[PDB]
């Protein structure tokens, strides 16, 4: 019993985590086979950020001039190309450490463990959601840029994540590893607009349900209630509408709890309406939203 | 910027993992050296909970008895004791694996990294805290017993906590990895009393601070207070008195703030006295007791 906020084991993705240095600006890379991935803004200085031109700034840079470092391993760069907002340097030497990997581009309330890296060592491990604005709340200081986000499917990695830039509001955008950003950010330092962030609706219901599974049960009342009574209600409060492949995810929480789904939204439009009183669901007194069904029925039923 | 539950990376533990069977009964292993460490009870049966005579139950036991596998490769086991509450199986082979690593024995209110584990192979990291009354509040299912607690410092593995017992109250118990109980705890199948937990104030007040750096400042207010006059309000809310020793680590958090110990602690005061009035506090509606001082610096200063 119990249930936490809980990443990932990062071993696979440790082992993958350099160095780059391209002038005086050093963040991280990830050396997968014979080529290592950053953020293109490591080819900008002080007199850039506010409008770089990045095929201009490329342009005056060759191999010589990316000193790639896996701990104390200095790598040759071979060959380099701008795809996006990533820079993809070709090496010389495969990561003897390459773990079986694909590139993803997740969806808004999806879940992911990000590795935090400094100088490309690693410094924690956490996880998080993508915001349905695009936006992460993570937990990065300056050099951690290039940090990237993964989920991992028995042996598989999964990398979904790579962070670019803190926002002047404190949080976190990045990109895919094809380089291209999630939400309408740009890889300049301008104030740019996130906008209205929503409570992701499936996610807070899967963790309704893993109170339940886990003995917290105050909040089950003696109503039910429509899709679209839902939603009304929904949409008062800033949370993202509930469809019918909300519903029909959840189908495994609602069979282990025998929790029909719509009780369930009924239950959440009761603590919406009412708050939580001074009262606490697995040790909370907000909301969570940063758990997916699949991470409910993971952390509950023990996958490995 | 940005504060988040942060795990320690869990690589070099996950070398470590191993699956112990002894009849029926399978459970996790630490394979350090030619050692592999796991619970005492992987030698019971359903037939021995309630009391289980553990020298006993061993005597009826040999090398051969003992199935350590480490991924697809089978170990041989050249020799067993029992160390407390962990047996101790001498295999003949080192783990190629093995980091630098000590066993420490942690204090009420530390927090530590938990890497659960099923059958040998890693699950999830989490972070959490030795509770007060020497409790966890971890997220484990059946199997997850031998899954270890450590914290890291640069290269070196400190190994502190072994999960054993989820007690009828949904809370964890565990050892050392010299096989001594945190707190009064048996490894018996009987209802056993934890006894009152209280709130670790040193660790609410390193998270004011964090708060405090990453811009949230609603809760200082205009008031100081002393030590005295604190506890006396410690005391009725169930936090843990405060000590010099406590205002003494806070010291690096007040540089960096310019706020005095003591004119934080009138802030914790009247948030005890008056609630939160429903706002949040780096995204909680609660007091979080769960960082120390030092997590707190390490995050905030990015310690790798
Ligand atoms: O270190 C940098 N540098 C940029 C500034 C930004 C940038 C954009 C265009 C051209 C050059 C640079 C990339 C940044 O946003 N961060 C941080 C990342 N995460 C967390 C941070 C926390 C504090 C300060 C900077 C951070
Ligand atoms: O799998 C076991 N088995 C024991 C029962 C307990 C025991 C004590 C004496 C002799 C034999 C066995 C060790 C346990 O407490 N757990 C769990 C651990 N963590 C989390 C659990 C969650 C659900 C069920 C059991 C759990």
Redesign the pocket.
Known sequence: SGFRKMAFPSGKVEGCMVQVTCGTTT?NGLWLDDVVYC?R?VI?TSE??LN?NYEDLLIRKSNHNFLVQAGNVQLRVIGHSMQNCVLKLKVDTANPKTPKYKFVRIQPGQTFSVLACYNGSPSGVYQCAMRPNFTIKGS??????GSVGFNIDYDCVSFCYM????LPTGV?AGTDLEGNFYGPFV???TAQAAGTDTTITVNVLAWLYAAVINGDRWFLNRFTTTLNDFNLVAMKYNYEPLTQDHVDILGPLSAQTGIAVLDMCASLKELLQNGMNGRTILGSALLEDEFTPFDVVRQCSGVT
């Open positions: 963040l953020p803004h900008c850039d950020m770089p990065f200081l300056n050099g951690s840029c962070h670019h830039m803190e976190h890889d300049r330092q």
